[PDB]
Every structure is written in C-alpha cells, then in structure tokens.
Ligand SMILES: C[S@@+](CC[C@H](N)C(=O)[O-])C[C@H]1O[C@@H](n2cnc3c(N)ncnc32)[C@H](O)[C@@H]1O
Ligand SMILES: [Zn+2]
C-alpha cells in the first residue's frame with residue numbers, strides 16, 4: 732500500500748491534534764432538553780456506612796449493579812459512598828499519542844483495576860437535524876473523524892467541537908474498556924469502565940458497537956485476531 736507509506740510520514744509531522752474546547756459536563760444545543768427527577772425517584776441501595784467499601788466496585792451495591800449513581804443526601808452510606816464517580820470526575824491519568832492507522836489515541840499513565848470508572852463520554856448534546864448537518868459537512872470536506880454517540884432518541888453527544896479525553900479513545904474488537912449508560916441525578920450519562928486490569932502505558936479502547944454515527948462504512952484497523960472488519 733502507498734496509503735501506508737503516506738501514514739508513516741504523517742505520524743512524524745503532526746505534533747498536536749486539531750484543537751477542541753475541553754469541557755467537564757455535557758452542553759445541550761438548540762431545542763435539546765436535559766431532565767431531572769425529585770430525590771424520591773433515586774433508589775436507596777443495600778450498602779451501610781459500617782461496610783468495608785460502601786457502594787464500591789466489589790460491594791453488593793444494587794445501585795452500582797443496576798447502573799444508578801447514588802445521591803449523597805439519599806445514600807445510607809452517606810459521605811462514605813464510593814458510587815458518585817460521574818459527579819466527582821475522578822479519572823485515571825491519561826495522555827494523547829499518535830497511532831499509525833487510527834489517528835490520535837489515548838493511553839493511561841497509571842494501572843487501572845477491572846470495573847474501575849475510566850472516564851465519561853462528554854460533548855455537545857445535539858439533535859438529529861444538527862447531527863445530520865455536521866455529518867453532511869464532514870462528508871463534503873473528506874473528514875473521516877466522527878465523535879458522535881447517541882444518548883437517546885434525538886439527543887446525540889458530539890465530543891468533536893467540545894469534549895474531554897474520552898474523545899481520543901479508538902474502537903477495538905478486542906477492547907479493554909466498555910461504554911455503559913448510567914442513570915445520574917435523574918438523567919442518562921455515558922461512562923467508560925475497564926473490562927480488565929490495564930497496565931500503565933497501554934492504549935484505552937472500547938467496542939463502539941456501531942454507535943459512532945458516520946462510521947457505518949469504516950474498515951476497522953484494530954488488528955485483533957477476531958476483528959469484525961467494522962467499528963462494531
Ligand atoms: C472518537 S474518534 C477517536 C480519536 C481519533 N482517532 C482522533 O484522531 O481524534 C473516532 C474516529 O477514530 C477513527 N477510528 C477509531 N477507531 C478506529 C479503528 N479501529 N479503525 C479505524 N479507524 C478508527 C475513525 O476515524 C473514527 O471516526
Ligand atoms: Zn450502595
């Protein structure tokens with residue numbers, strides 16, 4: 732391939748990735764609503780303050796089991812609650828690096844335990860009409876990098892213009908992280924969680940599950956033995 736010879740030159744030249752606005756929390760756009768519930772619609776888990784790790788990765792916690800974050804004024808474990816990861820934004824340390832075939836990627840600077848919260852997939856929250864427009868734009872300009880992930884009907888996260896490090900995590904068919912929809916303070920959020928123990932220096936990947944909007948035709952370069960050929 733003469734395509735490859737090109738990408739070898741490229742990997743040496745581009746020193747920084749294209750710029751984006753680094754945000755902490757989803758930012759709705761146009762008509763897009765964000766929902767809330769009364770505290771009464773937030774479940775109280777089975778954990779106790781006296782437990783060893785109340786609401787932790789390895790506890791019996793029904794909230795964590797059913798992908799509900801605890802509310803700190805509702806959880807019986809109180810401030811000892813280890814199930815407030817989205818709200819608190821404590822992420823493992825990570826850094827951007829340049830791959831050969833998959834643009835910029837993300838690698839951890841620390842060890843990560845199986846089940847650990849790694850990041851939230853954060854961006855602009857846009858509708859289908861704004862999503863179609865941005866994908867049309869990118870097609871007309873030979874752009875193949877998409878950052879769009881559906882939260883629910885007519886609410887799409889675009890980590891492209893605005894987002895956090897999660898936007899640099901490539902698809903793999905043999906991934907070490909997984910995307911999950913959690914209920915947080917009465918609305919949905921997308922979290923990334925380690926499938927296994929990950930060593931410092933390793934790239935962080937997830938199965939896009941064909942949810943990366945615009946990548947429907949894209950050939951997978953993950954290089955795994957069981958590669959599907961596609962971003963799913
Ligand atoms: C959320 S971005 C990930 C970061 C991106 N690599 C960058 O340089 O900003 C997703 C895009 O990365 C590329 N990509 C990610 N995983 C890939 C894979 N396994 N094979 C091919 N391209 C991939 C595609 O262009 C896709 O639209
Ligand atoms: Zn609990």
Ligand SMILES: [Zn+2]
Pocket residue numbers: 776778785786794801806807808812813814
């Ligand atoms: Zn709790």
Ligand SMILES: [Zn+2]
Pocket residue numbers: 903904905951952953954955957958959960961
């Ligand atoms: Zn693959």
